[PDB]
Enzyme design. Structure first.
Site, PDB file in Angstrom:
ATOM      1  CG  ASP A 127      -2.091  -0.959   0.809  1.00  0.00           C
ATOM      2  OD1 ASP A 127      -2.686  -0.030   0.585  1.00  0.00           O
ATOM      3  OD2 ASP A 127      -2.257  -2.125   0.771  1.00  0.00           O
ATOM      4  CE1 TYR A 159      -2.500   3.306  -2.473  1.00  0.00           C
ATOM      5  CE2 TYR A 159      -4.540   3.693  -2.233  1.00  0.00           C
ATOM      6  CZ  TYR A 159      -3.508   3.126  -1.952  1.00  0.00           C
ATOM      7  OH  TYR A 159      -3.665   2.298  -0.680  1.00  0.00           O
ATOM      8  CG  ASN A 193      -8.502  -2.349  -3.654  1.00  0.00           C
ATOM      9  OD1 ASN A 193      -7.314  -2.636  -3.210  1.00  0.00           O
ATOM     10  ND2 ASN A 193      -9.534  -1.348  -3.104  1.00  0.00           N
ATOM     11  CG  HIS A 194      -6.203   1.895  -4.961  1.00  0.00           C
ATOM     12  ND1 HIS A 194      -6.848   3.150  -5.048  1.00  0.00           N
ATOM     13  CD2 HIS A 194      -6.422   1.524  -3.547  1.00  0.00           C
ATOM     14  CE1 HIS A 194      -7.469   3.427  -4.139  1.00  0.00           C
ATOM     15  NE2 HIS A 194      -7.425   2.397  -2.937  1.00  0.00           N
ATOM     16  CG  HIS A 278      -4.562  -5.720  -1.706  1.00  0.00           C
ATOM     17  ND1 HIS A 278      -3.567  -4.915  -1.489  1.00  0.00           N
ATOM     18  CD2 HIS A 278      -5.665  -4.895  -1.758  1.00  0.00           C
ATOM     19  CE1 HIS A 278      -4.031  -3.414  -1.289  1.00  0.00           C
ATOM     20  NE2 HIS A 278      -5.397  -3.702  -1.344  1.00  0.00           N
ATOM     21  CG  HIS A 287     -10.796   0.658   5.980  1.00  0.00           C
ATOM     22  ND1 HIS A 287      -9.629   0.864   5.269  1.00  0.00           N
ATOM     23  CD2 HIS A 287     -11.827   1.140   5.123  1.00  0.00           C
ATOM     24  CE1 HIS A 287      -9.720   1.644   4.075  1.00  0.00           C
ATOM     25  NE2 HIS A 287     -10.968   1.593   3.930  1.00  0.00           N
ATOM     26  CG  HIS A 315      -7.622  -4.003   1.108  1.00  0.00           C
ATOM     27  ND1 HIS A 315      -7.743  -3.290  -0.018  1.00  0.00           N
ATOM     28  CD2 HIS A 315      -8.918  -4.492   1.243  1.00  0.00           C
ATOM     29  CE1 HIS A 315      -8.943  -3.165  -0.247  1.00  0.00           C
ATOM     30  NE2 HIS A 315      -9.705  -4.021   0.657  1.00  0.00           N
TER      31      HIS A 315
HETATM   32 FE   LIG Z   1      -4.654   0.756  -0.199  1.00  0.00          FE
HETATM   33 ZN   LIG Z   2      -6.454  -1.985  -1.211  1.00  0.00          ZN
END
Ligand SMILES: [Fe+3]
Ligand SMILES: [Zn+2]
Ligand SMILES: *[C@@H]1O[C@H](CO)[C@@H](O)[C@H](O)[C@H]1NC(C)=O
Ligand SMILES: *[C@@H]1O[C@H](CO)[C@@H](O)[C@H](O)[C@H]1NC(C)=O
Ligand SMILES: *[C@@H]1O[C@H](CO)[C@@H](O)[C@H](O)[C@H]1NC(C)=O
Ligand SMILES: *[C@@H]1O[C@H](CO)[C@@H](O)[C@H](O)[C@H]1NC(C)=O
Ligand SMILES: *[C@@H]1O[C@H](CO)[C@@H](O)[C@H](O)[C@H]1NC(C)=O
Ligand SMILES: *[C@@H]1O[C@H](CO)[C@@H](O)[C@H](O)[C@H]1NC(C)=O
Ligand SMILES: *[C@@H]1O[C@H](CO)[C@@H](O)[C@H](O)[C@H]1NC(C)=O
Ligand SMILES: *[C@@H]1O[C@H](CO)[C@@H](O)[C@H](O)[C@H]1NC(C)=O
Ligand SMILES: *[C@@H]1O[C@H](CO)[C@@H](O)[C@H](O)[C@H]1NC(C)=O
Ligand SMILES: *[C@@H]1O[C@H](CO)[C@@H](O)[C@H](O)[C@H]1NC(C)=O
Ligand SMILES: [Fe+3]
Ligand SMILES: [Zn+2]
Lengths: 424, 424
Positions: A127, A159, A193-194, A278, A287, A315
């Site tokens: 991340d 990101y 996911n990003h 991830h 979260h 994540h």
């Molecule tokens: Fe993230």
């Molecule tokens: Zn993520």
């Protein structure tokens, strides 16, 4: 909190059509091949790479390939990917890229031949992103007194998708930002996911597009059919990478691949078995709480069954470490749905706290559940130091601490060679 | 128990380049478009379709497209897909296909305009295959006194993948076999595991290839980006189709699609909300026991939240019906992991017992758990008869019984208009 475009960190190497965004990775299954990748922006350029070892200075040339992609109103520069093969183990090599106009030189060191007691030290970053915080984490890593030799990246690279139309420039800046590390030591990639970047609105609907053009992996070396899951052996570890956002249903390619792969692992050969993904299977922060359930219900037993040692995930922008725990007895109606200590189960660690866009996940499930051994909402990175076929030492360095302050530390006893209670 | 190649059922229509394997489906979101598909084997042929309504005999022509694919040492004939648009509702239409050489004529009837109290009767077939058993199920369906008007197919079409190198001829025979039904009434398709056909050994590694060439769906009508999940409205129902073997992780395209789709459902418009998927979320047979868990942990709450009425699935070659049940309170450590009656939860039915390759799943979790209302290991099909905006009647006809014997029957009270305990 994302570093501004002018940040010294994003400066472009001077020279006409100067190789920028240089980055490497393992190019084969066992350590003797590297994938060199870079980008030229002025004109296509050569995809040749010149390299030679410190000892036998015979300069050799490898020829790679070039590609380009368009995102929305964006247009890549010229992406290059060249694979260097048949390297000698444990050797420093020099490589030059940008042979036609502006040449840049780098070096990397091949790892030891795979072995039972071959030590090696992995860095753990997940991340990252490009906020100042990220800059800091990357420095701390660079300064770790126990120097890392390969980063295991757990997902969410830049990101850029937070920017409008996923402004792919932010992928170019990120790549220039991280070059100082990746141009010299491999980073093993994991898709987060990003990276999916499913943007129907701007008509970009092919998942993982920019990620996949820019970052390549030796997936065909394992016999994977996709770059989203694969494995590599390095030193004494057998690392398996998975894709939380790809498919794992029964019979799907990822599911089928993993099943056979777990059978190909030989612990007499690589004692340490590590898995990357991830989305975390075990996580007590609010979260993303319980998103790992689906995958958990599908791969947990296999992990326990094969005694994998650790499972690193990102994540959740915070840190957490678990107890060797399993929760594999549920049968819907029998009520056995509570994580119990299990010494065959791996330790599930989460290090998605390298920085992202400068935000931390602090909300935690109060009270700290039993399976959770330690958790903290601080930015930082980790190091997993393999010493023996029985010992490996994990550390977590907070950004607030000095470079040498391990805010968390734990010795791992090998689930296969020394399966003794390492749990606190 | 698969019918032999010579079976009368597999005979090829006589004539040079005679359209074979004819099959239709809804071509738009609401009922006024059809997708006509067929195969010509001698030569390419025309992809035009001639059609006209029984009343206004103005013969019109639609022009479609042609395609071919190669599987391993297999080579398709010429596949044609033509979409007829702007049909009048509730009208019998005639269509002719094979205009260049050997012409064949068929007819279908458009459905009523979507409405609150528009009745309609759906047939439920899942896991058909091509054993004699399958032939029987298809007949019983054809003879159902309450005649079906559209089949909702729950996956696993032909089982060609059981044959060596997935002998795609078995896809050609299946298509000729089912023509007697599908050439006249639409079948809504759902992708099952036998459709994935991931065969690395023979170098065929693109999932759903033969299936996707042969069977097309109006996925772009919902705003889906893949033919593996989509939805259609027909009469008084809003049907949503899902893909157990595609990806549903958070942020993936299917996950994202379904979320918005559930919001687009208007019950004042289509009172009945139906969902289709291959792998069953709730199933008490031993075979494939708990495979639906992953998807369950991801979509259950949404279903309950939106009060979907029924969820049809296949995969287990037997029949089972449930209690309106939910299991959405688990939080890992709180111990709430037992299905409790919930009148907002849908009824989960499983009809993968249409025949397959002649085999039934008889082993059941003894004793029948609470959530299970009824289960039986017999071949058969189902019918879901919408009567009102409040009433729909489901029936299950065993193959052993005569055509009119409902071995199971239940009235569904609309979760949105008449949410009264319909549970036994
Ligand atoms: Fe993230
Ligand atoms: Zn993520
Ligand atoms: C892309 O479009 C946005 C607005 O849609 C604009 O402001 C931006 O400068 C554009 N970028 C390029 C490279 O055209
Ligand atoms: C780049 O390299 C080529 C060949 O080495 C040379 O002819 C050219 O003038 C160089 N400089 C630029 C700006 O292209
Ligand atoms: C990033 O960190 C490096 C030292 O590790 C420093 O030289 C540089 O100025 C920093 N830049 C920013 C924008 O934080
Ligand atoms: C692009 O923009 C939107 C988002 O899907 C849509 O209206 C349009 O049809 C899209 N596709 C094309 C080819 O323009
Ligand atoms: C492995 O490493 C630990 C710590 O470095 C050491 O104490 C232990 O004796 C070593 N094991 C072997 C077999 O050398
Ligand atoms: C395909 O290969 C198999 C053996 O591999 C052979 O027996 C079969 O007849 C072949 N089919 C075609 C159409 O060539
Ligand atoms: C098929 O149709 C064409 C044009 O209608 C005709 O000329 C041809 O001879 C027909 N028969 C065959 C066997 O091709
Ligand atoms: C299939 O069923 C039909 C009647 O529904 C019958 O005419 C046909 O002979 C049967 N064929 C086989 C192979 O079962
Ligand atoms: C086809 O057969 C096998 C299965 O993967 C393999 O040995 C071979 O490399 C495959 N691919 C090609 C292009 O031949
Ligand atoms: C709906 O159908 C049932 C059975 O056909 C009938 O008894 C009931 O009264 C109907 N409801 C309405 C509102 O007509
Ligand atoms: Fe089946
Ligand atoms: Zn199935």
């Amino acid at each position: 909190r994302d570093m501004p475009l002018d940040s010294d960190v994003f400066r472009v190497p001077p020279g006409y059509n100067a190789p920028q965004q240089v980055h490497i990775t393992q190019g084969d299954l066992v350590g003797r091949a590297m994938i060199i990748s870079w980008v030229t922006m002025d004109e296509p350029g050569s995809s040749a790479v010149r390299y030679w070892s410190e000892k036998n200075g015979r300069k050799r040339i490898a020829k790679g390939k070039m590609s380009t992609y368009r995102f929305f109103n964006y247009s890549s520069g010229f992406i290059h990917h060249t694979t260097i093969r048949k390297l000698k183990y444990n050797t420093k090599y020099y490589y030059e890229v940008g042979l036609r106009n502006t040449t840049r030189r780098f070096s990397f060191i091949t790892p030891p031949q795979t072995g039972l007691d071959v030590p090696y030290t992995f860095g753990l970053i997940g991340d990252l992103g490009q906020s100042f915080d990220s800059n800091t984490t990357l420095s701390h890593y660079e300064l770790s007194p126990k120097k890392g030799q390969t980063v295991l990246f757990v997902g969410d690279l830049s990101y850029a998708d937070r920017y409008p139309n996923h402004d792919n420039v932010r992928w170019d800046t990120w790549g220039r930002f991280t070059e100082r590390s990746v141009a010299y030591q491999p980073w093993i990639w994991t898709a987060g996911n990003h990276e999916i970047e499913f943007a129907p609105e701007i008509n970009e609907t092919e998942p993982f597009k920019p990620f996949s053009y820019r970052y390549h992996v030796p997936y065909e070396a394992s016999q994977s059919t996709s770059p989203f899951w694969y494995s590599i052996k390095r030193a004494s570890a057998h690392i398996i990478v998975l894709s939380s956002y790809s498919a794992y249903g029964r019979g799907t390619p990822q599911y089928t691949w993993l099943k056979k792969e777990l059978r190909k692992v030989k612990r007499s050969e690589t004692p340490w078995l590590i898995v990357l993904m991830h989305s975390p299977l075990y996580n007590s922060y609010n979260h993303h709480f319980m998103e790992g359930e689906a995958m958990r219900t599908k791969f947990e037993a296999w992990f326990v069954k094969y005694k994998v040692d650790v499972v690193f995930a990102g994540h959740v922008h915070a840190y957490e470490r678990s107890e060797r725990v399993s929760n594999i007895a549920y049968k819907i109606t029998d009520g056995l749905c509570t994580p119990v200590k299990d010494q065959s189960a791996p330790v599930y660690i989460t290090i998605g706290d390298a920085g992202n866009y400068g935000v931390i996940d602090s909300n935690m499930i109060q009270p700290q559940p039993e399976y959770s051994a330690f958790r903290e909402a601080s930015f930082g990175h980790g190091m997993f130091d393999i010493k023996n076929r029985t010992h490996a030492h994990f550390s977590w360095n907070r950004n607030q601490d000095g470079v040498a302050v391990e805010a968390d530390s734990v010795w791992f006893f090998n689930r296969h060679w020394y399966p003794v209670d390492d749990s606190t």
